[PDB]
Subunit: 95 residues, 5 copies
């Protein structure tokens, strides 16, 4: 999994029918030190993360494991909103 | 998923027979700021995307989840044509 | 698999229900020369790895193979704490040291 | 999928028995401008591609989807020999040239 | 698949029980002339590769296709020891 910051949304009307009703969040990757990286991922979000929240996300077939997604062509998923990250027994991030 | 721009087409006549009927789009990767990247992906397209359109695409076994591709050796798929990308409540891209 | 060093933990209370009970470790990538890299991975850990320990971790659907995780949306898993790494029949890493 | 150029073959006699019969091609990655990259992949070839031909290839479990490969430990597969690549409706690559 | 040079072994005693009995080889990624690349992989080896030998290895769920590993959390596997790499119909590596 990687840590991402919610930066926005992607909307698509003409799409594979299996993807109807799925919310797409634009996530900015965060590095080991809590700072933005230029990389991004667009991920399905069934949890409900808002702008600027940190999330844990997974890539690959992991994205199909959430209820309803077993046969969706989805390769990235938000699995949780992050409350805390600690590094070397000190807080890096606290929501 | 990542964002790509449709830049062209790949044609193959001598190929695995399980790949017959798949249209191959050449996608140019788009970065966090809506800027073209030197990276590309060739993806199966069952949505019907044309030149210069922005698309959301998935990689890996996600590509086999679309009806008719369950046992094709495909590892990238166009899942939707993008209408809008919003960042921090402002438009980055609008079709 | 890759080698990672345990640098910390990630906690999430609002998450996919399948993920309840899973401990998340922040891993720093270690290279083939035993040096840390500016890359990280957050992995599920059911083996009890502690801070500063080196671990072997797997990515992708490998993460779902451990009993309990078959239908979890996890893509990285700690599979063991490393005791030794040898290169060219010589010690590179020894936990006991 | 990515585009690769066929550079040669890899031969292995001592190998997992499930891999018997599989031809291994060394592929050099091609970039967005049709130029060779330092990166490579070794792919199973059931299509029959020759030296310097451009191919499309897939990675991951995609490689297991062709007849005979369902339970093979293969993670890269040649899926087609490329005849043409177009960009902006104009040729970038034509096999005939 | 890619080409690795066997450089060492990794030993782990505190581990997932499914993984007991698996030999872990430290592989240095190399190109076809044997030049080191800045990547490595720790791979399951059921073939029996020794130090400095060249091997073909696979990543991902491919590693679970070997008998005995169907339900192991393994994501890299040695599939064979390399005898020759021919380029432009000329031998570049010979064992």
């Amino acid at each position: 999994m990687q840590i991402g910051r919610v930066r926005g949304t992607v909307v698509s009307s003409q799409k594979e029918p299996s993807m109807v009703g799925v919310k797409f969040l634009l996530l900015q990757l965060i590095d080991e030190a809590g700072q933005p990286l230029p990389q991004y991922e667009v991920a399905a979000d069934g949890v409900g993360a808002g702008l600027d929240e940190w999330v844990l996300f997974s890539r690959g077939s992991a994205a199909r494991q959430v209820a309803g997604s077993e046969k969706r062509p989805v390769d990235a998923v938000v699995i949780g909103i992050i409350d805390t990250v600690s590094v070397d027994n000190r807080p890096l991030y606290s929501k």
